[PDB]
Design a protein around this ligand. Structure first.
Ligand SMILES: *[C@@H]1O[C@H](CO)[C@@H](O[C@@H]2O[C@H](CO)[C@@H](O[C@@H]3O[C@H](CO[C@@H]4O[C@H](CO)[C@@H](O)[C@H](O)[C@@H]4O)[C@@H](O)[C@H](O[C@@H]4O[C@H](CO)[C@@H](O)[C@H](O)[C@@H]4O)[C@@H]3O)[C@H](O)[C@H]2NC(C)=O)[C@H](O)[C@H]1NC(C)=O
Ligand SMILES: *[C@@H]1O[C@H](CO)[C@@H](O[C@@H]2O[C@H](CO)[C@@H](O[C@@H]3O[C@H](CO)[C@@H](O)[C@H](O)[C@@H]3O)[C@H](O)[C@H]2NC(C)=O)[C@H](O)[C@H]1NC(C)=O
Ligand SMILES: *[C@@H]1O[C@H](CO)[C@@H](O[C@@H]2O[C@H](CO)[C@@H](O[C@@H]3O[C@H](CO)[C@@H](O)[C@H](O)[C@@H]3O)[C@H](O)[C@H]2NC(C)=O)[C@H](O)[C@H]1NC(C)=O
Ligand SMILES: *[C@@H]1O[C@H](CO)[C@@H](O[C@@H]2O[C@H](CO)[C@@H](O[C@@H]3O[C@H](CO)[C@@H](O)[C@H](O)[C@@H]3O)[C@H](O)[C@H]2NC(C)=O)[C@H](O)[C@H]1NC(C)=O
Ligand SMILES: *[C@@H]1O[C@H](CO)[C@@H](O[C@@H]2O[C@H](CO)[C@@H](O)[C@H](O)[C@H]2NC(C)=O)[C@H](O)[C@H]1NC(C)=O
Lengths: 1140, 172
């Protein structure tokens, strides 16, 4: 009947391709600002079309029971939810949730959201592992730093004669309202916060007349305070993911003290550690989603094969001749490698685009590329005639070449759109076929559309979905409460007030920079709704990225003379001569770190350093002597390590000579590199890495070439357009009410003081652009680059505030193709390159010398076996049922509760809470200590000798003895000691591990590979050590701007080691770069006198400045990626002996 | 950077000597305005005097014992100062005494002009015929103690190794 008629309608494609269109139109509609002619009628139009779909989807399947069967599948289940909400709003994220229809219609996407949810079913064992693990750092991080970020730099009021701010006649009343005021306090120019200052001995002092008081606002907006558990926890969470974490680091060291680096080394290193423990859960999950794809599909390749098998049982003469004259040369290989000559030669010719380019270059590069256009056209037309046009077409590179020629001849007609010259350069991939490893990169890029092209849409949808969420919930709010954010009420550079800016702010927050948005977001939005989005956009967003970034990998699968020599070789063999040298190395280098600024302040240590290095040098002369007559000139030079001791001590020959140049203070500054030969543990790391390096060169060659095309393209778009006309006084760019040209900029300068400055790191050359392309990969300093680059107008024009905002795409079209697919190839080669070396070249395993292998194996027998039976029932009228007290499981779970209430006892400790709350906590703390002390004491009597056996009991008896001390120390009481006394209270919460099991297995594997995790850092500390002393002799006293403010300078070895670590994880490297980049005046007083030292000028060289950091980040990124290997082979090494 | 160093006080007669006084503002950053005044306790008696005063020109003080002789090698130009050191040309034995510098600065923050002052004291000690300074001599000698000491273990152990193995050489 009528009901039946529906069923014909329901099963159609030709009605579903109307539902494919009403999404693809409502998807595009929800984007823009609201149009009023296409009013809520449209809102009502795409209301009923889903209703008219749901009606057919229910008037197909029966009456109420039939409708219910309808709702057995979850997809049909959501559909009801969206329509149900939309229909109600007759009388709003739910409008956005219409766009989830996109996933429902396609039967290919339903496999994915069925995978990316089942993979989240598995990972929930490791969340608890971490959220408990984060929270035990917070209670450590809260009690050290409670209210430390609140510190402000506050005035001390004038004790003058007249009563102009008379407080030496009355300072009693206004006090608590005085120090809140922003005007009274301090903050250097250009900081929307005050100046955090902590009054420990070493940490970050404040201008005279001012003092370090506690009370104030908080950092940023209020969302950085340690006080209170959550916000501190959020910061702690921030430090795990490395989102703008340098600033947090910076404001902790300034506030609390310089010596709290040791906290942010435990945080960052473990913070990293739990990230790799989430990732290895996905590896042990996303193998299982590709094990079943090889279990059932081959079985379905057997199910079809089994059943299938059963069923079975003048001119026209030269229209071919001159065609053959074409067809002869093309199949000859003197056409083939001729083209790859012209492609590479075309690439370079293009690249030389220096910025100014007078008519010599400006005619050369114009008339140059027209020659290559003749080459590429005659490449094309002589390949059309050769093999039938359609045949030529079928190969897609003949089709891709075909594309560029049409594009190539477009450019002549034009005589902004000159990016089209650079689409020649995609012909490089043509090279690939000959090439070995670029043929993996075009395998990877084509794989994101091919057999894994289903997944990219789920990324491309889910990234889009949050761009409509944040548009709706906040877009009207940034119009209305804008003022909280800016100074002038003009709409910051990352807003929700449109779609397309909204899209970037989810593309940014997917890259792992989401704090700088939330500070804003929470304030003009609200506290709960903003935080509900961002935590979501990571946890969904991060998971989607991991599957994409893992699954791309897994688819890319004389008798006296002689005796003298022996003695010489024999004396080197002795441990005494060898460890005497080792103490000569560590003491020479230890005097070496006394080098900088403060050396003019102490007089004797300038003298001690001067005379000791001769003796140290002389010891190494004796060693260079005795290595020779030991090994002989052949065997000495051919050893790799022994080359260095000839070089470094040889540079000490050429230094002691020149009394009878300043270059050779560099080499001496390199002499603690020689401990690599001497210590066994480092050498294994040096050896393994060397193996890594040859391949790395080939991976690097791809990327340098691949980026190069981007670098060439970038210069064309942006070169010399970064110049900005800048006022000196505020360093605001001039408005463009006046100064459209630089030629009219000059006239203003004549009358005034206002200057026209370049951008320091920009796309002026193909190599200077190369640098700015590195900044926008490692996510640091990239904000400055864009803001200029968005606003660019012409070669001479002055950039207005917000022209050309579609040029964020050039970074987004890069950072995907140049950071994601690039780096995913780089990891794709190494984790194969250690599959070859460990199996084929590996003796047993790696990163461990010979005794570390045995101590590794001593820790294997610890975990697997260790089990004693019932002990010391010891029945006695003095000790009867006490064996029931220790051993009954009525107890064991209940002691978990006694920590757990004590765990939330310490979570209410906030700042400024008043005594009464504090008094209760103090009383509560005493009670908790007594309970375990009585309990542990109870355990001791019952078990006499036997209990001491469990190491948990020993740990239990470790921790309670500590907690006894924590209260008697308080009856004694220095602020610094007292806080770290309360750090001992945290260790009671660590007792919950042997309850957990799930946590306790993976956290044991930390222990399992920690000595291999000791060398990786030991060579890392050596690497840090070299760049510190090389930093001090160059980059002290450079003009302190940006990242080198008052603490984080290379003035000493004190501040460098702090400064470097910040840069080991590749944060703030931009911050460091700008001072050293800058040269001359303006910006150099050079001839300037620092008061105290012996060197004039604050100028920092651009030569020494670039290769310092760029060869540190490459040395950053190998050894830490080396570190991630020696965890991953051990936690994937546990998963194979476990299964079998 | 900026580091304050306490000057030298052992000086050689007939000589141009430097008493350098550096006071570093607790926050080498905020714009200041300074003046240096030198004062002198003779070993005649304990009564100071002006001998030198400075504000972005040469401050010359009539004190005939020290007049027509001094010279500013302090921080030149910006009158931010920090480092005021003057030179005492042609030192004689009548110069032995105790100096006291006064930096008085009006740091004008940029919100509220404020002033403060600092005192360093230097006891000049004129000694004829300059020595090296008793830690340049001392580390001169301790170097050759270690160098000779080592040059022995080298010929100890070599002679000691040399006898030992040619003794095992007759067994081969
Ligand atoms: C190192 O850092 C610490 C903090 O991190 C600094 O400590 C600050 O030092 C200031 C001066 O030394 C202190 O100023 C005093 O604070 C008193 C606080 O009184 C408040 O009264 C209100 C009234 O309701 C209460 O709510 C508050 O809780 C406070 O108790 C001022 O009253 C005081 O003024 C005088 O105090 C005396 C009492 O001795 C009165 O009899 C007198 O008539 C007058 O009122 C003065 O202003 C400041 O409070 C203190 N910070 C804190 C948090 O206590 C160190 O100074 C830093 N070290 C250095 C060298 O600067
Ligand atoms: C670069 O920025 C500086 C700082 O704002 C600008 O200097 C400012 O110039 C204006 C005049 O163009 C001055 O305004 C006048 O101030 C006096 C107060 O003494 C007032 O009585 C007048 O009615 C007028 O408002 C202003 O004082 C001055 N600011 C400072 C700090 O000196 C400068 O104009 C900018 N550069 C360019 C090229 O515009
Ligand atoms: C940037 O440079 C361009 C030229 O390179 C400037 O355009 C020129 O602007 C001036 C005045 O702004 C114009 O001068 C006046 O033009 C009228 C037109 O008849 C004439 O009667 C006047 O005697 C006077 O010459 C000039 O014509 C104009 N030229 C062009 C080609 O546009 C532009 O103004 C500069 N940018 C800024 C912000 O000034
Ligand atoms: C103070 O120390 C300065 C250098 O530290 C000493 O410089 C000397 O100054 C006298 C000034 O009378 C020079 O005497 C000159 O003699 C020549 C020839 O008789 C005459 O032509 C000049 O008019 C002048 O009188 C003397 O050459 C110069 N020494 C050197 C090496 O250039 C000076 O000795 C010290 N002051 C006193 C008062 O001794
Ligand atoms: C340093 O000052 C003393 C002042 O007591 C000078 O000593 C006197 O010098 C005069 C020469 O003008 C002699 O006539 C006196 O006899 C000295 N005093 C005594 C107590 O004997 C001394 O000359 C000054 N130094 C120099 C280099 O002139």
């Amino acid at each position: 009947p009528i009901r039946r008629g529906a069923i014909r309608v329901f099963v159609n494609s030709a009605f579903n391709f109307f539902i494919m269109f009403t999404i693809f139109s409502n998807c595009i509609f929800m984007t823009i600002s609201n149009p009023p002619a296409w009013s809520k009628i449209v809102e009502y139009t795409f209301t009923g079309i889903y209703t008219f779909e749901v009606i057919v989807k229910v008037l197909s399947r029966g009456f109420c029971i039939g409708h219910f069967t309808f709702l057995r599948d979850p997809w049909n289940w959501l559909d009801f939810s969206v329509v149900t909400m939309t229909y109600i709003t007759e009388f709003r994220t739910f409008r956005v949730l219409r766009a989830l229809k996109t996933i429902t219609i396609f039967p290919g996407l339903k496999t994915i959201v069925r995978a990316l949810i089942e993979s989240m079913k598995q990972m929930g064992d490791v969340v608890i592992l971490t959220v408990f693990s984060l929270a035990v750092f917070t209670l450590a991080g809260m009690q050290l730093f409670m209210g430390n970020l609140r510190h402000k730099c506050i005035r001390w009021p004038i004790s003058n004669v007249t009563l102009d701010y008379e407080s030496a006649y009355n300072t009693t009343f206004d006090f608590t309202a005085y120090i809140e005021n922003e005007e009274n306090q301090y903050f250097l120019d250009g900081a929307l916060d005050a100046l955090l200052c902590g009054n420990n001995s070493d940490a970050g002092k404040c201008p005279e007349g001012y003092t370090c008081m506690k009370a104030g606002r908080n950092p940023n907006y209020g969302y950085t305070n340690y006080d209170n558990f959550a916000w501190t926890f959020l910061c702690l969470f921030r430090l795990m993911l490395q989102d703008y974490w340098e600033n947090l680091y910076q404001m902790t060291l300034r506030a609390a003290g310089k010596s709290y680096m040791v906290f942010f080394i435990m945080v960052i290193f473990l913070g990293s550690f739990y990230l790799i423990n989430l990732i290895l859960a996905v590896v042990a999950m996303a193998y299982e989603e590709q094990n079943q794809a090889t279990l059932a599909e081959a079985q379905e390749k057997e199910a079809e094969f089994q059943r299938a098998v059963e069923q079975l049982r003048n001119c026209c003469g030269p229209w071919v001749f001159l065609k053959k004259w074409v067809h002869f040369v093309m199949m000859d290989p003197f056409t083939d490698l001729f083209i790859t000559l012209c492609i590479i030669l075309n690439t370079l010719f293009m690249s030389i685009e220096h910025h100014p380019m007078n008519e010599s270059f400006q005619s050369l590069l114009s008339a140059g590329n027209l020659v290559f256009t003749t080459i590429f056209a005659a490449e094309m037309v002589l390949k059309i005639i050769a093999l039938d046009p359609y045949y030529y077409f079928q190969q897609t590179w003949n089709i891709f070449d075909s594309i560029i020629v049409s594009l190539s001849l477009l450019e002549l007609g034009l005589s902004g759109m000159s990016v089209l010259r650079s689409l020649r350069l995609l012909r490089i991939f043509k090279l690939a076929k000959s090439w070995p490893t670029l043929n993996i990169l075009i395998k990877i890029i084509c794989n994101s559309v091919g057999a894994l092209g289903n997944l990219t849409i789920v990324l491309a949808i889910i990234v889009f979905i949050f761009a409509l969420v944040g548009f709706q919930l906040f877009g009207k709010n940034y119009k209305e409460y804008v003022c909280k954010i800016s100074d002038d009420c003009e709409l910051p550079r990352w807003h929700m007030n449109d779609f397309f800016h909204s899209f970037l702010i989810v593309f940014r927050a997917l890259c792992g920079e989401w704090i700088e948005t939330m500070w804003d977001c929470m304030e003009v939005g609200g506290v709960p709704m903003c935080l509900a989005v961002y935590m979501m956009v990571i946890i969904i967003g991060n998971l989607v990225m991991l599957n994409l970034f893992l699954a791309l990998l897994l688819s890319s699968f004389g008798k006296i003379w002689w005796n003298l020599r022996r003695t010489c070789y024999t004396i080197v063999e002795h441990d005494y001569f060898e460890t005497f040298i080792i103490f000569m190395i560590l003491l020479s280098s230890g005097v070496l770190a006394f080098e900088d600024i403060y050396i003019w302040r102490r007089r004797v240590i300038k003298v001690i350093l001067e005379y000791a290095d001769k003796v140290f040098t002389y010891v190494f002369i004796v060693e260079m002597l005795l290595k020779w007559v030991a090994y002989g000139f052949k065997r000495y030079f051919t050893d790799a390590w022994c080359w260095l001791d000839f070089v470094i001590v040889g540079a000490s020959i050429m230094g002691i000579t020149s009394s009878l140049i300043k270059n050779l203070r560099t080499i001496r500054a390199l002499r603690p590199l020689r401990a690599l030969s001497r210590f066994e543990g480092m050498k294994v790391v040096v050896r393994a890495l060397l193996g890594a390096i040859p391949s790395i060169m080939n991976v690097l060659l791809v990327c340098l070439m691949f980026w190069l095309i981007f670098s060439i393209m970038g210069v064309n778009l942006f070169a010399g357009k970064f110049y900005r006309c800048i006022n000196t006084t505020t360093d605001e760019i001039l408005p463009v009410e006046e100064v459209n040209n630089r030629s009219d900029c000059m006239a203003l300068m004549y009358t005034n003081e206002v200057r026209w400055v370049n951008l320091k790191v920009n796309y002026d050359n193909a190599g200077m652009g190369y640098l700015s392309l590195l900044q926008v990969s490692t996510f640091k300093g990239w904000m400055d680059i864009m803001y200029a680059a968005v606003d660019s107008r012409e070669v001479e024009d002055q950039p207005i505030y917000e022209i050309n905002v579609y040029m964020y795409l050039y970074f987004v079209i890069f950072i995907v193709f140049g950071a994601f697919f690039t780096l995913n190839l780089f990891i794709g080669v190494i984790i194969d390159n250690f599959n070859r070396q460990k199996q084929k070249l590996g003796g047993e395993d790696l990163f461990m010398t010979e005794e570390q292998k045995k101590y590794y194996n001593a820790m294997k027998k610890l975990g697997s076996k260790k089990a004693a039976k019932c002990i010391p029932r010891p029945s006695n009228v003095v000790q009867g049922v006490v064996y029931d007290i220790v051993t009954q499981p009525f107890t064991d779970i209940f002691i978990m509760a006694l920590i757990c209430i004590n765990m939330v006892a310490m979570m209410v400790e906030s700042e400024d809470q008043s005594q009464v709350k504090k008094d209760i906590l103090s009383q509560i703390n005493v009670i908790f200590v007594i309970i375990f002390t009585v309990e542990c004491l109870l355990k001791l009597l019952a078990l006499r000798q036997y209990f001491f056996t469990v190491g948990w009991n020993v740990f239990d008896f470790a921790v309670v003895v500590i907690s006894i001390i924590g209260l008697l120390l308080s009856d004694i009481i220095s602020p610094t000691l007292f806080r770290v006394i309360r750090l001992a209270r945290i260790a009671r919460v660590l007792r919950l591990i042997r309850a957990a099991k799930g946590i306790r297995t993976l956290l044991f594997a930390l222990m399992m590979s920690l000595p291999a995790l000791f060398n990786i850092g030991l060579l890392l500390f050596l690497i840090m050590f070299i760049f510190s002393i090389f930093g001090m002799s160059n980059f002290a006293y450079v003009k302190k701007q940006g990242g080198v403010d008052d603490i984080f300078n290379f003035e000493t070895f004190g501040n460098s080691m702090i400064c470097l670590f910040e840069i080991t994880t590749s944060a703030g490297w931009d911050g460091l770069l700008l001072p050293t980049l800058n040269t001359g005046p303006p910006d150099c007083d050079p001839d300037v006198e620092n008061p105290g030292t012996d060197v004039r000028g604050n100028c920092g060289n651009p030569g020494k400045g670039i290769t310092f950091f760029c060869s540190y980040i490459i040395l950053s990124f190998l050894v830490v990626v080396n570190m991630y290997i020696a965890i991953i082979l051990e936690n994937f090494g546990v998963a194979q002996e476990e299964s079998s | 950077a900026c580091v304050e160093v306490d000057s030298d006080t052992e000086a050689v007669v007939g000589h141009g000597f430097k008493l350098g006084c550096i006071s570093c503002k607790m926050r080498g950053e905020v714009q200041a305005s300074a003046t240096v005044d030198w004062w002198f306790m003779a070993k005649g008696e304990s009564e100071f005097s002006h001998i030198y005063s400075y504000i972005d020109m040469t401050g010359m003080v009539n004190d005939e014992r020290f007049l027509d002789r001094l010279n500013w090698m302090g921080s030149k130009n910006t009158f931010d100062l920090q480092d005021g050191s003057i030179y005492i040309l042609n030192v004689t034995l009548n110069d032995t005494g105790t100096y006291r510098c006064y930096f008085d600065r009006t740091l004008t923050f940029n919100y509220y002009e404020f002033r403060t002052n600092i005192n360093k004291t230097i006891t000049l000690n004129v000694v004829p015929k300059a020595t090296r300074g008793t830690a340049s001599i001392l580390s001169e000698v301790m170097m050759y103690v270690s160098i000779i000491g080592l040059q022995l273990w080298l010929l100890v152990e070599m002679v000691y190794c040399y006898r030992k193995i040619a003794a095992a050489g007759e067994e081969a």
